[PDB]
C-alpha cells in the first residue's frame, strides 16, 4: 500500500496543537529547546501518540462537571474532567492525560458553557492555567477561573471552548504541563524530537493564536498538521524506511520549491541554518517522493 | 477508483455546520421544513457546494477588520469581512457568501479577537445576529455587538471565534440568512434536500451546541460529517450511480445494524417513519456496500 500525503494547501491545513488554521511554515535552530509536543503526534503508519486524537475542534477543549467552588476563592472553580465525548477518563489509560489536553504551559482563555439536566444554559469567559499546581488533568481534575463567581452551576454538564491565550507572560509552547501536578513526573509521553543530521532543522506548521490582552505575537508550532494525522490514521500504510522524502511542489508551475525529510516518528526536517518564515505559494503542497535513509543529504533551502 | 468512506466512529466525527463534535444520529419527518444547509455540502465525487470549505475550526468563524463603530450605537460594530485565510472576499465569486459563513438564522455567540499591526491584542465577547438586516456577508460586511464599547480597535486584523448561540429565541437552523441583506435573493445555493422515496427520511448527524443563556437544547444537524467531506474531496472518486448503499456496522460483532442510501448529491436517507435519536454502538461506522439505484428499497430501521 503506497504511502501518500493528502493534497492540501497551506490554506487548507489545521494546527494539530490548537484548533485554528495553519498560517505559515517556520524553521529555526533547536538550540537548548526540548521540543516534545503531545498533541499533533503520529507515526507515519498512523499510530497516534501522546495526547493526540482525531477531532481538530476538540484540541485544547475540556469536558466534565464543576464539583465545587474553590474554597476561599472568588471566581475560581474545580472541574472533574471527562474525555471529549463525555466518557469517564481512566487515569490508568497509558497516556499523559486525556486526549486533547493542552500540551503547553500558560493561561488558556476561552468560554465555559453548561447545559443543566433541565436544559438551563449559561456561557461565561474562563481561564485555565496549565502551569498551575491545580492543573492535574491526569488525575481527572483541573481548575477554572471566571470573572464572575455567581453564575456557574455545580454538577451540571460543562464544556470549555478554547479561544486563545489569556496573557503572554509565562507562555512557553514547549514547556509541558505537569499533567499529574507538583513533584510528579509525566508518563506515556511521545518522545522529544530534534534534528540529528548535520545542517538540518525541524520544519514547523505555525499558527498565530488569539490573545486576550497585552502586546505580543504568541505562536503555536505543530510537527504535522491535523489533516496529515487524520490521513495517516486512515491509511495505516507501513513505513518502508525511517524517512520519507517529500517535496513541496507548486502544482501550477510544477516547480519543486524545496525538499524535506518526513521522519517515521512523525516530524519533518529540512536543510536550513537560520530561523526564517518560509514563504510558499498558496497553491503549493508537499508530495511524497520516495523512501530514503536517515542519512540522505537534502538540498539546502 | 473504488468508492470509500473514512473509518470513523461517532466519537471521531465533526459537525460540518458548526465547529463541534457530532453527538448522535437523528432522523425525523421532513414535514413543511425546507432543508437547505450551505455548510456541509459535498457531492460524492468530492465537489464542495454552497459555502462549504475544508477547515472544521473555520466553520462559522469570521475574519476581517472593524471599519467603524455603528453610528448612534453603543456596543455595536461594523466588520468588513475577508476569507478565512485573510484574503479578500470577491463578491462576484459564484457562492452564496464567503466560505464558512454560518448558514442558519440566529444570534451567534463567540469571542472577537484582534492583533494590531503593533501586536497590541484584545479579546472580548461578541454576538453576530445572522437574522439581522445588517448581516450582509455576501456584500462583504456584517455587524458585531460587544458588551463593552470602548475596547475594540479600528482597522486592525480581527477574527471571530464562534462558541455557540447567544439566545434560543429566533434560532432556526434551516432558515438561511439573507446573505446580501433585505429584499435580495440568495445566489449559488446548494439545492434543498428531501426524502423523495416513499417511507424514507433524511438521516442527520446532530450536535447539541452551547448556549449563553435561557432554557433550551439547541441542535445543529448536518447532512455529512466534516471528515466525510474531507475524504470525498481527497478521493474525488467518480459516482457510479445516484445512490451508494451504505451499512452501519459494528466492527466487533460484525452486526450490520441498519442500512442507508448515500445520495450522489451528498445526503443520506433511511427507511424510517418517526422522529427518533438513533442509538448506535460507540465502535460502529458506515461502510460502503455497493452502488444501487434511487428506487432501491431499504430495510426499515
Ligand atoms: C495592550 C493592551 O492590552 C489590553 O489592556 C490591558 C488590560 O488587560 C485586560 O483588561 C482590559 C480591560 O481593561 C481588556 O479586557 C484586556 O483584554 C484584558 O486582557 C490590563 O492588563 C491593563 C492593566 O493596566 O493593561 C492593559 O494594557 C487590551 O485591552 C488593550 O486594548 C491593549 O491591547
Ligand atoms: C435560564 C438562565 O439563563 C441565564 O440567565 C438569564 C439572563 O441571561 C443573560 O444574563 C445572565 C447574567 O444575568 C447570564 O450572563 C446569561 O448567560 C445571559 O444570557 C437574563 O436573560 C435574565 C433576564 O432576567 O434571565 C436569566 O434567566 C443564565 O445566566 C442562568 O444561569 C440560567 O441558565
CATH of the domain at B90: 2.40.30.120
- H-type alpha helices, chain A: 226-235
Same domain flag for A45 and A162: no
Neighbours of B67 (CB within 10 A): 12
- Residues forming beta bridges with residue A120, ordered by sequence position: B215
Please give, rounded to a whole number of angstroms, the shortest distance from the CA of B271 to a CA of chain A: 28
Of A114, A147, A166, which residue constitutes the final position of a domain?
A166
For residue B287, the domain's CATH number is 2.40.510.10
CA-based nearest distance B165→chain A, Å: 9
d(CA A157, CA B211): 12
C-alpha cell at B92: 462576484
User: Are B21 and A120 a contacting pair at CB < 8 A?
Assistant: no
Residue B169 CB less than 6 A away from ligand 2: no
Cite the DSSP H helix spans in chain B.
Answer: 226-235
CA–centroid distance, residue B161 to ligand 1 (Å): 19
| Closest alpha carbon to A147 in B194, B151, B83, B124 | B124
Does A234 touch chain B if contact means CB atoms closer than 8 Å?
A: yes
CB-based contact, A280 to chain B, within 8 Å:
no
Q: What is the extent of the structural domain holding A231?
A: 1-58+167-301
Q: Which of A54, A210, A217 sits opposite B123 (nearest CB)?
A: A210
Count of C-beta atoms within a 10 Å radius of residue B121: 24
End-to-end Cα spacing for chain A: 31
Q: Return phi, psi of residue B168, to 5°.
A: -95, -30
A214 lines ligand 1 (CB under 6 A): yes
Strands (E), A116-199: 120-129, 141-145, 157-165
Q: How far is B84 from chain A (nearest CA, A)?
A: 8
Q: Nearest C-alpha to atom 14 of ligand 1 is from which residue?
A: A213
How many C-beta atoms surround the C-beta of residue A183 within 10 A? Answer: 7
Which ligand 1 atom is nearest residue B121's CA? 33
Judgement on whether residues A41 and A189 belong to the same structural domain of the protein:
yes
- Plot region of B119 (φ>0 → left; ψ -120 to 50 → alpha; else → beta): left
Dihedral sign, CA of B259, B263, B267, B270? Answer: negative
Cell output for A92: 490508568
Strand partners, A222: A205
Q: Chain B residues with CB inside 8 Å of A84's CB?
A: 11, 21
SS3 B300: coil
CA atoms within a 13 Å half-sphere pointing along the CA-CB vector of B116: 13
Q: Are residues B157 and B185 in the same domain?
A: no
**SS3 state at A235:** helix
Total tally of structural domains belonging to chain A: 2
Nearest by CB: B159 against A12, A210, A215:
A210
Q: Based on the domain organization, do B179 and B160 belong to the same domain?
A: no
Of B124, B148, B166, at which residue does a domain stop?
Answer: B166
Q: CA of B180 to nearest chain A CA: how many angstroms apart? A: 26
| Greatest distance between any 2 Cα atoms in chain A | 65
Tell me the technique behind this structure: X-ray
Domain boundary among B166, B189, B218: B166
Q: Which residue has the cell 462549504?
A: B52
Residue linked to cell 464558512: B100
In a shared domain, residues A261 and A180:
yes
Beta strands in chain A (DSSP E): 24-27, 62-69, 76-82, 107-115, 120-129, 141-145, 157-165, 200-208, 213-215, 219-222, 243-249, 256-263, 267-271, 276-277, 285-292
Whether residue A189 sits in one domain with residue A178 = yes
- Decide whether any atom of ligand 1 lies within 6 Å of the B151 Cβ: yes
The residues, any chain, with a CB within 8 Å of residue B73's CB and separated by 6 or more, are none
Q: Do A211 and B11 touch (CB under 8 A)?
A: no
**B276 and B266 part of one domain:** yes
Q: What is the residue with the minimal CA distance to atom 7 of ligand 1?
A: A213
Q: 3-state class of A273 per DSSP?
A: coil
A105 and A32 in a common domain: no
Residues A255 and A273 placed together within one structural domain of the fold: yes
- Beta-ladder partners of A62: A160
| Closest residue by Cα to residue A235 from A43, A40, A34 | A43
Q: Report helix, strand or coil for A99.
A: coil
B224 φ/ψ angles, rounded to the nearest 5 degrees: -140, 140
The C-alpha angle A60, A175, A61, rounded to 5 degrees, equals 5
Helix, strand, coil share (%) of chain B residues, nearest 5: 5, 35, 60
- Supply the residue whose CA is at minimum distance from atom 18 of ligand 1: A213
Interface of B with A in 235-264 (CB under 8 A): none
Pairing outcome for strands B219-222 and A62-69: unpaired
Query: What 3-state DSSP class applies to B138?
Result: helix
Contact residues on chain A for B55, CB-CB shorter than 8 A = 12, 14, 21
A201 and A140 fall within a common domain? no
Angle, vertex CA A15, rays to CA A11 and CA A17, nearest 5? 175
Closest residue to A215, CB basis, from B58, B118, B214 = B118
CA torsion, ordered A273, A279, A283, A285, to nearest 10 deg:
20
Q: Which chain A residues have a beta carbon less than 8 Å from that of B57?
A: 14, 19-21, 56-57
Does residue A99 sit in the same domain as residue A154?
yes
Same domain flag for A12 and A157: no
B191 touches ligand 2 (CB under 6 Å): no
Q: Are A37 and A51 in contact (CB under 8 A)?
A: no
Cβ–ligand 1 distance for A279 under 6 Å, the answer: no
Contact B39, B17 (CB under 8 A): yes
State the DSSP string of A53-89. -S-TTTTT-EEEEEEEEPTT-SSEEEEEEE-TTSPBP
Shortest CA distance from A20: residue in chain B: B57
Q: At what angle are helices A226-235 and B226-235 packed, to 10 degrees?
A: 70
Q: Find cell 438521516 and name the residue.
A: B203
Cβ neighbours, 10 Å, residue B74: 11
Coil, strand or helix at B137: helix
Query: Chain A to chain B, count of Cβ pairs less than 8 Å apart?
Result: 131
3-state secondary structure B8-36: CCHHHCECCCCCCECCEEEECCCCCCCEC
**Chain B closest-CA separation from residue A30 CA (Å):** 25
Amino acid at each position: 500500500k503506497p504511502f501518500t500525503l493528502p493534497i492540501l494547501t497551506i490554506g487548507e491545513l489545521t494546527n494539530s496543537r490548537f484548533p485554528v488554521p495553519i498560517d505559515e511554515l517556520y524553521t529555526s535552530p533547536n538550540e537548548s529547546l526540548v521540543v516534545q509536543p503531545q498533541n499533533g503526534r503520529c507515526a507515519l503508519d498512523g499510530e497516534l501518540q501522546g495526547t493526540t486524537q482525531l477531532l481538530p475542534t476538540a484540541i485544547c477543549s475540556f469536558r466534565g462537571r464543576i464539583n465545587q467552588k474553590v474554597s476561599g476563592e472568588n471566581h475560581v472553580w474545580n472541574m472533574q474532567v471527562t474525555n471529549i465525548n463525555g466518557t469517564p477518563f481512566d487515569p490508568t489509560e497509558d497516556v499523559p492525560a486525556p486526549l486533547g489536553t493542552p500540551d503547553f504551559s500558560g493561561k488558556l482563555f476561552g468560554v465555559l458553557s453548561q447545559r443543566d439536566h433541565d436544559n438551563a444554559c449559561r456561557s461565561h469567559d474562563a481561564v485555565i492555567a496549565t502551569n498551575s499546581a491545580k492543573f492535574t488533568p491526569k488525575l481527572g481534575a483541573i481548575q477554572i477561573g471566571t470573572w464572575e463567581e455567581d453564575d456557574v452551576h455545580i454538577n451540571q454538564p460543562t464544556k470549555f471552548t478554547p479561544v486563545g491565550l489569556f496573557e503572554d507572560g509565562g507562555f512557553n509552547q514547549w514547556t509541558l504541563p505537569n499533567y499529574s501536578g507538583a513533584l510528579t513526573l509525566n508518563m506515556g509521553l511521545a518522545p522529544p524530537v530534534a534534528p540529528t543530521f548535520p545542517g538540518e532543522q525541524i520544519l514547523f506548521f505555525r499558527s498565530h493564536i488569539p490573545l486576550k490582552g497585552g502586546v505580543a505575537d504568541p505562536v503555536i508550532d505543530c510537527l504535522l498538521p491535523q489533516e496529515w494525522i487524520q490521513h495517516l490514521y486512515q491509511e495505516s500504510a507501513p513505513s518502508q524506511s525511517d524517512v520519507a522524502l517529500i517535496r513541496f511542489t507548486n502544482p501550477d508551475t510544477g516547480r519543486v520549491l524545496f525538499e524535506a525529510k518526513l521522519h517515521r516518528s512523525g516530524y519533518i526536517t529540512v536543510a536550513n541554518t537560520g530561523s526564517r518564515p518560509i514563504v510558499v505559494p498558496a497553491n503549493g503542497y508537499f508530495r511524497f517522493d520516495s523512501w530514503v535513509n536517515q542519512f540522505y543529504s537534502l538540498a539546502p533551502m
